[PDB]
Amino acid sequence: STLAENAGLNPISTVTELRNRHAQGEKTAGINVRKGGISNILEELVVQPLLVSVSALTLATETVRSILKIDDVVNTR
Amino acid sequence: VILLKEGTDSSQGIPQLVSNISACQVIAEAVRTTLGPRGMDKLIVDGRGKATISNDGATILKLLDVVHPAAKTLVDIAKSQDAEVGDGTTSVTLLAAEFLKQVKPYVEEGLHPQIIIRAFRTATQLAVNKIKEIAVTVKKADKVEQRKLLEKCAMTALSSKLISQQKAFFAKMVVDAVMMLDDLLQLKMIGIKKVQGGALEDSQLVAGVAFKKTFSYAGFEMQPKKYHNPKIALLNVELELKAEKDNAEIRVHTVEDYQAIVDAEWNILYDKLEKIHHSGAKVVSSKLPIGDVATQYFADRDMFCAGRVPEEDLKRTMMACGGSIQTSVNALSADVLGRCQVFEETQIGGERYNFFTGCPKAKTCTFILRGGAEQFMEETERSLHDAIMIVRRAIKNDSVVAGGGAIEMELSKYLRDYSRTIPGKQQLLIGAYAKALEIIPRQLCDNAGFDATNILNKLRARHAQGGTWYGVDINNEDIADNFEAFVWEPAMVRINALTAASEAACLIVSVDETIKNPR
Amino acid sequence: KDQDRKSRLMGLEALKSHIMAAKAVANTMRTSLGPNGLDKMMVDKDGDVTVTNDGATILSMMDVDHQIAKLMVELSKSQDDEIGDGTTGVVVLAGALLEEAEQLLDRGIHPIRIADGYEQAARVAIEHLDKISDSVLVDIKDTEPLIQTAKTTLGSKVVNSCHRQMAEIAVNAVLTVADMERRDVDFELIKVEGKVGGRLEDTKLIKGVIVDKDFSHPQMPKKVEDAKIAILTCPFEPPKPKTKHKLDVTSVEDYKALQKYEKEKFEEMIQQIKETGANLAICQWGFDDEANHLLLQNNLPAVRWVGGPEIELIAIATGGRIVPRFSELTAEKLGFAGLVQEISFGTTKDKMLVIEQCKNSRAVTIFIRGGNKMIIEEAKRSLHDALCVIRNLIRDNRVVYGGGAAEISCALAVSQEADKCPTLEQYAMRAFADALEVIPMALSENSGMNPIQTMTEVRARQVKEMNPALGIDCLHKGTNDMKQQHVIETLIGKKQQISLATQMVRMILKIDDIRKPGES
Numbered sequence A: 001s002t003l004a005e006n007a008g009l010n011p012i013s014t015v016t017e018l019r020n021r022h023a024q025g026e027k028t029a030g031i032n033v034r035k036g037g038i039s040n041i042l043e044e045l046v047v048q049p050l051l052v053s054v055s056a057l058t059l060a061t062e063t064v065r066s067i068l069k070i071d072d073v074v075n076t077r
Numbered sequence B: 001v002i003l004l005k006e007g008t009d010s011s012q013g014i015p016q017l018v019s020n021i022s023a024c025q026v027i028a029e030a031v032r033t034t035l036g037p038r039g040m041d042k043l044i045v046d047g048r049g050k051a052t053i054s055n056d057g058a059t060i061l062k063l064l065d066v067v068h069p070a071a072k073t074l075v076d077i078a079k080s081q082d083a084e085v086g087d088g089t090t091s092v093t094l095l096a097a098e099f100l101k102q103v104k105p106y107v108e109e110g111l112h113p114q115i116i117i118r119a120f121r122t123a124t125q126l127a128v129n130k131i132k133e134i135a136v137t138v139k140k141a142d143k144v145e146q147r148k149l150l151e152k153c154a155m156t157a158l159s160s161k162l163i164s165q166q167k168a169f170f171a172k173m174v175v176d177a178v179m180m181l182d183d184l185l186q187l188k189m190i191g192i193k194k195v196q197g198g199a200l201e202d203s204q205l206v207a208g209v210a211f212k213k214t215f216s217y218a219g220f221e222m223q224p225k226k227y228h229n230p231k232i233a234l235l236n237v238e239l240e241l242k243a244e245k246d247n248a249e250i251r252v253h254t255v256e257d258y259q260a261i262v263d264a265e266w267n268i269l270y271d272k273l274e275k276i277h278h279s280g281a282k283v284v285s286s287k288l289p290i291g292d293v294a295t296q297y298f299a300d301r302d303m304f305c306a307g308r309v310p311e312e313d314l315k316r317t318m319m320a321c322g323g324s325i326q327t328s329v330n331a332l333s334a335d336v337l338g339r340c341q342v343f344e345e346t347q348i349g350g351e352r353y354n355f356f357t358g359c360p361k362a363k364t365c366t367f368i369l370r371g372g373a374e375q376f377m378e379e380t381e382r383s384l385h386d387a388i389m390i391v392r393r394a395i396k397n398d399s400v401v402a403g404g405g406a407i408e409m410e411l412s413k414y415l416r417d418y419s420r421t422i423p424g425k426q427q428l429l430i431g432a433y434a435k436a437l438e439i440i441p442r443q444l445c446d447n448a449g450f451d452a453t454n455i456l457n458k459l460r461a462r463h464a465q466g467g468t469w470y471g472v473d474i475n476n477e478d479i480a481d482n483f484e485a486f487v488w489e490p491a492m493v494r495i496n497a498l499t500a501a502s503e504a505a506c507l508i509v510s511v512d513e514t515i516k517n518p519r
Numbered sequence C: 001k002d003q004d005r006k007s008r009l010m011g012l013e014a015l016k017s018h019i020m021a022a023k024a025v026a027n028t029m030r031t032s033l034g035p036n037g038l039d040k041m042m043v044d045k046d047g048d049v050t051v052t053n054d055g056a057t058i059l060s061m062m063d064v065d066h067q068i069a070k071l072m073v074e075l076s077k078s079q080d081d082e083i084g085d086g087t088t089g090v091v092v093l094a095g096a097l098l099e100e101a102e103q104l105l106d107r108g109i110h111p112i113r114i115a116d117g118y119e120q121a122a123r124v125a126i127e128h129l130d131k132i133s134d135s136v137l138v139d140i141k142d143t144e145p146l147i148q149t150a151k152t153t154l155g156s157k158v159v160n161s162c163h164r165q166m167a168e169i170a171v172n173a174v175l176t177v178a179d180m181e182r183r184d185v186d187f188e189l190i191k192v193e194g195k196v197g198g199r200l201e202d203t204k205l206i207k208g209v210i211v212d213k214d215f216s217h218p219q220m221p222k223k224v225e226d227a228k229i230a231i232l233t234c235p236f237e238p239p240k241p242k243t244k245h246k247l248d249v250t251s252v253e254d255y256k257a258l259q260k261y262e263k264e265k266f267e268e269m270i271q272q273i274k275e276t277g278a279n280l281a282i283c284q285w286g287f288d289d290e291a292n293h294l295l296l297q298n299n300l301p302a303v304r305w306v307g308g309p310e311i312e313l314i315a316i317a318t319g320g321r322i323v324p325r326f327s328e329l330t331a332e333k334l335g336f337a338g339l340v341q342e343i344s345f346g347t348t349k350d351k352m353l354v355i356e357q358c359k360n361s362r363a364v365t366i367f368i369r370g371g372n373k374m375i376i377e378e379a380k381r382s383l384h385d386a387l388c389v390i391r392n393l394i395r396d397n398r399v400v401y402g403g404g405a406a407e408i409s410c411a412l413a414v415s416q417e418a419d420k421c422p423t424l425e426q427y428a429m430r431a432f433a434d435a436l437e438v439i440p441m442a443l444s445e446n447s448g449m450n451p452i453q454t455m456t457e458v459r460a461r462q463v464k465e466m467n468p469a470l471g472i473d474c475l476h477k478g479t480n481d482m483k484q485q486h487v488i489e490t491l492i493g494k495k496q497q498i499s500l501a502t503q504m505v506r507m508i509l510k511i512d513d514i515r516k517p518g519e520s
Helices: A002-006 A011-026 A050-066 B014-029 B057-064 B069-084 B089-102 B102-109 B114-132 B144-158 B165-181 B255-279 B290-302 B311-321 B376-398 B404-421 B426-436 B441-447 B452-465 B490-507 C013-034 C055-061 C067-079 C088-106 C110-131 C144-156 C158-177 C252-276 C289-299 C308-318 C373-395 C405-418 C424-434 C436-446 C451-465 C491-510
Strands: A030-031 A037-040 B010-011 B039-046 B052-053 B190-196 B232-235 B283-286 B302-304 B344-346 B353-355 B363-373 B400-404 B470-472 B479-481 B488-490 B512-516 C006-010 C040-043 C049-052 C190-196 C204-206 C207-211 C227-232 C282-283 C339-345 C348-356 C363-370 C399-401 C488-490 C512-517
Touching: A002 A011, A011 A030, A011 A037, A011 C289, A011 C424, A050 B069, B010 B014, B010 B400, B014 B069, B014 B089, B014 B102, B039 B114, B039 C289, B052 B057, B052 C067, B052 C110, B057 B069, B069 B089, B069 B490, B069 C339, B069 C399, B089 B102, B089 B255, B089 B426, B089 B441, B089 B490, B102 B114, B102 B426, B102 C308, B114 B426, B114 B490, B144 B165, B144 B376, B165 B232, B165 B363, B165 B376, B232 B255, B232 B311, B232 C067, B232 C289, B255 B376, B255 C252, B283 C308, B290 B302, B311 B490, B344 B488, B376 B488, B376 C491, B400 B404, B400 B490, B404 B426, B404 B441, B404 B452, B404 B470, B441 B452, B441 B470, B441 C289, B452 B470, B452 B479, B488 B490, B490 C405, C006 C013, C013 C055, C013 C067, C013 C436, C013 C491, C049 C373, C055 C067, C067 C088, C067 C491, C088 C110, C088 C491, C110 C399, C110 C405, C110 C424, C110 C491, C144 C158, C144 C373, C158 C190, C158 C204, C190 C289, C190 C348, C190 C373, C204 C207, C204 C348, C207 C308, C227 C308, C308 C348, C363 C373, C373 C488, C399 C405, C399 C491, C405 C424, C405 C436, C405 C451, C424 C436, C451 C512, C488 C491, C491 C512
Parallel strands: B039 C512, B190 B363, B232 B283, B283 B302, C190 C363, C227 C282
Antiparallel strands: A030 A037, B010 B512, B039 B052, B344 B353, B400 B488, B470 B479, C006 C512, C040 C049, C204 C363, C207 C348, C339 C348, C399 C488
């Protein structure tokens, strides 16, 4: 939704078209900012390794979990 | 001390025109979202506390009653539009304010108001000449029967609605209801009634006048409903036993006189009952309720009677049966009695319903609705009324143009390309006049939830390539040829809208001062 | 005119303000959902006080000046005619759909697009209810199971202590006034009355009409078995006016003369009763001691001081006519009935006129008894929904398992079908699923359980354990699977709930501006 916004597209209709494309298709569907629209990501030469998305969810969840487990902050001296 | 105004309020110049321009936009904002069939509604409340909910630009402006005088001019222009056309009040008010919005910064830059009027009078005439050029007459297109094309028009207007699946059934009856009238067509002549419960297919197409028939008094197992040539009585008299209107309170000091007083009070009902039979009225249709005793009278005399009829259905029967309304019953004669070929009580939906058929003055009909709720029938009442207007206007005028803002973009193209070849101050003004036409398709997209930017930009490209009829599709979020989709509007209606819109903007633009006599 | 001080509210803030008005009415009523619903205290304008948990009664007495709330109240007039009991289900579902819509307006979706999705999801859910439904009296008309359904309905009311007896009379009443094959039961033919004293177990069915009026004299015959009833406006005596006679007797010369004329009218009309063949003579006014003394000698019972609308109902029920004067009497204008009895109540002198037909009738009245008027009042409405429960089963014996089982099953179908709609209505379909869960999630809350844990636990049970839907055990019974608990709601009711709820959400969504002029 943020990529579609910066690419000059509708954030809702773009994300919506991808979910139907993903249920019917595969991961090839996505956003191509160079052309400004949905297209085959694998054909447009836009790819990243698996550790980026994996480490993102891992470190993000552990940080969100830590913020959730904090009940109060206490100062000392 | 010796002051010239002495409480007299008055201002003139550019601040007055800019002040009136902003007030004109406030009236458009109250009817900006009502543009289109799927437009948002407006709720209005009066001193009684009852709420009126409708997206009718004509009815909304009548209820606001704004005190600003520049707004009164726009509202008055809508009334002339109703008499001229009957619709297009939202387009005139919305489009007139758009001319004012675009010439607002030029007025502030010192451009004279009179120079602005010369552009509107010029661009309007050039637009009217282009409407008559692009307008096409459609009577026997490809030797297709007119009933076929008229159904495609009503189906498109009713598409994506509560009767979307059964739109074909409603399409046939709407065309058939219009075909049932005479040459002098009229929307007020046709009635639409609602019947709770049942499927959409069970909606009946009555040929004559009918009413809900809230009559629920005694007198059953009698009153033969069928009549071959009855005499229909149109009254507003109450024949109740102990009527709130008719009574006899005669105080006496004699037992024998009370027997006559109780009978005399009964005689008032009986004499009124006999005067109805004296003239030979087979069908008694009264506005006020009727008592159980009066039901037994005509039931024995082989005559029908049922009160609690609304005033509209009586007057709609007045034009149908060919008689007249008579509040009294003494002077009832053939001059007010009606006639029909078939009068029969029907039990559609379990409730009793009376209707006439084949009257001499049968210039009306009735549409019965069947649905699972009252709001499905209230929305369908006006949704079918739009299709009835579309079918009516196609019969009256065969010269039409593509709706959905298709002509507004061609005129925006022609006037913008014409303004380029006009040296002088009329260039920026005629171009501003062109850009103001794009508000009609822009709000049809906004009111429909679509992205007006993507459609109006894609639409402007198709018009530059040669598309003379492409416009906005309320159903699908895409550009479509409204001419091929049978979404048509008359060419004269669009002409009178621009004329009324330009005349309203010019009248506001020509104003410089507002004077107020203190009194 | 009157533009100054004109109230106005427009824009997207108005839609959120309209939603805030509907949520206030839904949050008020979601607590009174289910049999364990929390009651509501009503403070009448005249100083009276009452307590009840009925959704329709709450909306009727709720004095709301907001215009959006008044529309939600108007839906009760259309819903109670079909369902009767769960008007709360429509208001709670409507307020739930509006709350979830507020999350979609922030996303930038138009209100009409939200309404288009709910209408699409409603047809998905309404189509799902037709599949998982089950019949009771398919192809045969029977009275055994039909009585059992109403017995669970009255259990939700204060009359639960005497719920078993009133169900049988409810089936005979509807079957009497109309046939199951006709599928046309009219509430106008059905009437309900009652009086303080006794208990609710003394509820009886009177095939005909009952009016709280006594005979002309206690010495009259207490049984008119023959079917000849006269219904006059004046009594069989010297004619009198409606207010006061004011006879002028100057001296004894006028007394002996007028008494002869008066006594002649006493004998003339009292003997006219047997001329026309009428045994019972019902009259709007009372009889004099001279008249009742002659009625006794002739064995002619008569009723006194009968009310205005009471005289109308006796003519309709007995099949007679409202005779204006004795001169218009005839064989056709005499009413019909099988037995007329005077029934007192213990030590009270009510002595209501009981007109029995001694056969199957077309109109039946329901007499209620109890130790409190307000419990009798709530007892009257307890049968009104039972009439709808019976009327709904007569229109269609197909039904769906209640207790929240239907709402949870439809939410799964609406959620799966949302994947097949590639358009902005998809978010509204998912919102329709979450809004459906508020009804069962509200039942568990009103009973004192964890809502979400009880909600999702029944979801996975509806997906993993078995395909038949399972409800919530809000009454703290053994377990789920409300089919065993015999808690089953009608199919037409659930369809009208989702329909009227989607309509009420559609009407509020397409409204985007309210205008009203203030006091100048």
